[PDB]
Structures are given as structure tokens and as C-alpha cells.
Design an enzyme around this catalytic site. Structure first.
Site, short mmCIF file in Angstrom:
data_model
loop_
_atom_site.label_atom_id
_atom_site.label_comp_id
_atom_site.label_asym_id
_atom_site.label_seq_id
_atom_site.Cartn_x
_atom_site.Cartn_y
_atom_site.Cartn_z
N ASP A 43 0.82 -1.19 0.00
CA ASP A 43 0.00 0.00 0.00
C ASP A 43 0.89 1.28 0.00
OD1 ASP A 43 -2.20 1.50 0.01
OD2 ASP A 43 -3.13 0.61 1.83
N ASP A 45 -0.58 5.09 1.02
CA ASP A 45 -1.05 6.04 2.04
C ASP A 45 -0.97 5.40 3.42
OD1 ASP A 45 -1.96 8.43 0.47
OD2 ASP A 45 -3.64 7.15 -0.21
#
Lengths: 291, 291
Positions: A43, A45
């Protein structure tokens, strides 16, 4: 052998591990395979970027646009209102993950639509990103640098905004050839002004779908059967669903928030949980033994 | 407007241009399009890398292996013999380019086969590249850096050895996400030891073939209708044959060799010819106006 007691990075109070003997055996598989068998799936963020700095909350890619000079106070209001109604559903303990899917789709749709209305030119994204408060986790130059040095595949799989994400990493000097970004990319009109978003929505709960729609990528890496996965949500645990074959996979989760409520779940589901932790030093240390 | 007389880079004695008014109008098209419409298509050997330094001849990617510690004096004798016989055909002014095709295929085949015999492990390519005498042209950090900064596509299209080329650029810190390498890639066995080469041979005369076989890449860049092409051979003039649409294309050719024999030909076919020139400053100056 691999021994967590003797790695100082694993001794921080932020490091929570349900099953250390299991972790050690996985890390041992990673070490034996070396560079040739490794790939990263991550991922962005709150995983590669910081959740907070100087007491202060850090922006997601979406927030970078939400908060910029090209967006009205009133648009930020409506965006905040959306976040308050939909986030309550995201974090609702009663609904199942599958019942939340329609709500997530509407959230990203409504909030993307509000940005599309603000008139966002491709040309300005450099400026916007440059004056934003975005922060990469401590140790990112080492993280990206070791991986580019050994040509380790890195698949960044993000429900954020792809054009923003890429501009953050490009300005940080870590957007190397080994880094593939799969995200929600903006669609621009004749004048290079945002008019919509490309492909199928990626959100927090459907990463399984995007993972399988990237067969192309993963089939080219058939031999990279050792995986390190990094995320910050339960949904991120699906990001490795399209991998050709798996020999060893290590899953490392940032628990940035809702600590008391989610800790048990994260410990049960991630191999290594990193509680309110703003650095990449545990993953960097696994890399140092491996590469 | 564009004036070549007012750009100091274009005033070097190495810059030869048959038709400056046409060059000026192409550069003007490039400037109007800016970043959004630009893409780069380039050879590597003797184009991005130097032909010579300190009086001394610089290695091609193939030479990096030919000359490394994992390859014998007797192997080098055979490789030199091959270069002698097939190079004479390469430079034969009587055969047509089409008649040389079978000979090129034999040369790469024979000389790759001699390397496959030497036992070349993937793991050692870092070391080999690190102690080689490879040199990038002066101004390469600026070349690759402006392009990454503006996210300009760069398609490096090389008849060399791709694993070598990629290791040179990665150690130089310029193998950014914007750079796609299409070359002759090594195929490794179970033990990570070279056993052959992947795909269809790319050599000096069949770049048309590989340019069309990369439709995937080019169709994704439909809007990048302004092209700068760089090469060192007549054969490199085909590297743009797969581009979706062309609005403006500038072709810049390094004439490193056979200067008196080839100058007229290069001047007639490349827009800008760069005679015995070891820097990227003419292209970097066009980029400065453009980006």
C-alpha cells in the site's frame, strides 16, 4: 538462522508479533531465496507515507488535492461531510466487509466528482505536491534504494490518486524503474484538466479484484515466490491474491489508529504489527539480512 | 521562435546540420507541445554511453562481458576473430542492408553462444559492471533527471545485452520509472547461470521489427506525438516505426567513427549529426527549451 531477539529494530515497543517462531521461519525463507526470489507488494497512504508528524496529521494523496489552492473552502466542507458519513460506515463493527462495498464505491465516486468539479490541471500537480505537507516514512530512501540496487520488483497498490502518488515519489527521488504503481489514475481532457478517473475503482475492500486483474505483471515474475507485503488495513491483506506461486510471504501491518479496537485483529491477521510507527526500519532490517 | 545561432551548444564544431531551418521548425513543434506530448526513443551503446575516454576506447555492453574476469583469453581471441569477419560485412559498401541481415544474425548468435559457454551467473553482473570501464556521455545525469522530473517516456532500444545495460544505468542512479529497456535479455537456468537469450534477436538492422512488436507500449503513449530519437547508426532511424501518431520528430545521430565515409549519409538522414562528440548537451539544451 533468524533471531528476532537479536535484531534491535524488533525490540521497539511498537513492534507487536503474535507468533515470533512463525515470523522467524518466514524470514529464514526470505533469506535463503535472496534477491532472485523476492518481490514487494505494498500500500502507499499511511504505509509508505506517514500518518503523523510534529504532532500533526499528514495528508493522504486525496488530501493533497482536498487541501490545495485549486479547491474552495466550500468544496473541502462537502468533502469533510462525505468523510464523516462514509467513514462511520467504513468503521462500523456491525456490517460485514461485503456490505460496505457499495458504500465505499459511493464515497470515492462522490468525492472524486467533487474534485472533478474544481478544475484540476495536470500541469499544476508538481506545484501542489511541492507545497503539500506529505511525508514519507523514516528510512524510505534506504527502502527504495536497496530495492532498486538489487532490482527487486515493487508493486505499489493504492486506493489513492495515482498521479499524486507518482508525483510524491518522483519529487522524493525514489520512483525507480523497479516500482510499478497501480492506483486510481486521473483522466484528463483536451486541455489537460481532470475530467474523470481511469479503469475500475480501487478502494479499501476490493484489492482482491485489482490483484487478479494484474496477472500480466505477476506472471512475468513467476520466480519471485518470496513476498513481503505492507499495508495499514485488513483490506491490504488481499494485495497478494494474484501472485503466480507463493513460497514465503511476510505480512507487515501499520496500525496507525483505532489501536485498542483493532490490535487483536491485526495481530491475528498480519505477521508483524507496527503500532503508531512512522519508520520503515523493521522492513529495512529484513531487507538487510535478505538482499 | 527557435534560433540555433543563439544556442551555444549548437555552435560546437562537432554539430553538423544539413538543414537548420527545418531543425528550427521541428524544435519549435517540440517547444509548443511541451512535456505532455514528448517521448524519447534512443539507442544505448555509443549513443548514451561513450565511444571513447582518456584517448581510450570505451566498452559496449557486450564488451563488458567479453572483457570481464569470468571470460578467458582464448574466448576473447575467438570473439575478436568473429568481430573481424562479421564487422567487414557490416561495413561493406557493396552489400545492401537486407543482404547483411543473415550475417548479423550469425554474428550475435555465434558470439552470444561463446559467452553462454563461459558460465556467466546473474549474481556476478553487479561486480562485473562495477569494475568495467563503462562511461555514460557527459551530461547524462541532467538528461535522465529532467526527463524523470517531467515524467517523459524514454524507450531505450538496444541491440546490446539488456541485463548489462540495466546494471550500468542502475549503478549510475539514472534507471528511473520513466525508462523502458527493450534489448537482448539473458535467459538463466535453475542455478542463475546464463543459458541463452530471450525473445527475438535485436541487431543493428532489424529495429523496425522490434519497434512494431512494441505496439503495446506505443499505443499507451498515443498523445506523445512529439519524438526525439537518438542513435549512432543508419539502423537506429527505424526505432520510431511503431509510434502511434507523429506530429514532430527530431533525429539526432552520433557519428563516432568512419567520419569521412559516412558524414554525407548521416547529414542526409539524421536532422542533427554529432561528430566525435561525448556529451548529451545538444539534446539537453533542446530539453531545456521544451520541458
Amino acid at each position: 538462522a533468524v533471531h528476532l531477539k537479536m535484531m534491535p529494530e524488533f525490540q521497539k515497543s511498537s513492534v507487536r508479533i503474535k507468533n515470533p517462531t512463525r515470523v522467524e521461519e518466514i524470514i529464514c525463507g526470505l533469506i535463503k531465496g535472496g534477491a532472485a526470489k523476492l518481490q514487494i507488494i505494498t500500500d502507499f497512504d499511511m504505509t509508505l507515507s506517514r500518518f503523523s508528524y510534529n504532532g500533526k496529521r499528514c495528508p493522504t494523496c486525496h488530501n493533497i488535492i482536498d487541501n490545495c489552492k485549486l479547491v474552495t473552502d466550500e468544496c473541502r466542507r462537502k468533502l469533510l461531510q462525505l468523510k464523516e458519513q462514509y467513514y462511520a460506515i467504513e468503521v462500523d463493527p456491525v456490517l460485514t466487509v461485503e456490505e460496505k462495498f457499495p458504500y465505499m464505491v459511493e464515497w470515492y465516486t462522490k468525492s472524486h466528482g467533487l474534485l472533478i468539479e474544481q478544475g484540476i490541471p495536470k500541469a499544476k500537480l508538481k506545484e501542489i505536491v511541492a507545497d503539500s505537507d506529505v511525508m514519507l516514512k523514516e528510512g524510505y530512501e534506504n527502502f527504495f534504494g536497496k530495492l532498486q540496487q538489487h532490482g527487486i520488483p515493487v508493486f505499489i497498490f493504492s486506493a489513492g490518486i495515482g498521479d499524486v502518488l507518482e508525483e510524491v515519489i518522483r519529487q522524493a527521488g525514489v520512483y525507480h524503474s523497479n516500482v510499478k504503481v497501480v492506483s486510481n489514475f486521473m483522466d484528463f481532457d483536451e486541455n489537460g484538466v481532470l475530467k474523470g478517473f481511469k479503469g475500475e475503482l480501487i478502494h479499501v475492500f476490493n484489492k482482491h479484484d485489482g490483484a487478479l486483474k494484474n496477472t500480466d505483471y505477476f506472471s512475468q515474475l513467476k520466480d519471485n515466490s518470496n513476498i513481503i507485503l505492507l499495508g495499514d488495513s485488513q483490506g491490504d491483506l488481499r494485495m497478494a491474491d494474484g501472485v503466480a506461486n507463493v513460497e514465503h510471504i511476510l505480512k507487515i501491518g501499520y496500525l496507525n489508529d483505532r489501536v485498542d479496537e483493532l490490535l487483536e485483529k491485526y495481530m491475528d491477521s498480519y505477521d508483524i504489527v507496527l503500532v503508531k510507527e512512522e519508520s520503515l526500519e523493521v522492513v529495512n532490517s529484513i531487507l538487510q539480512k535478505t538482499l
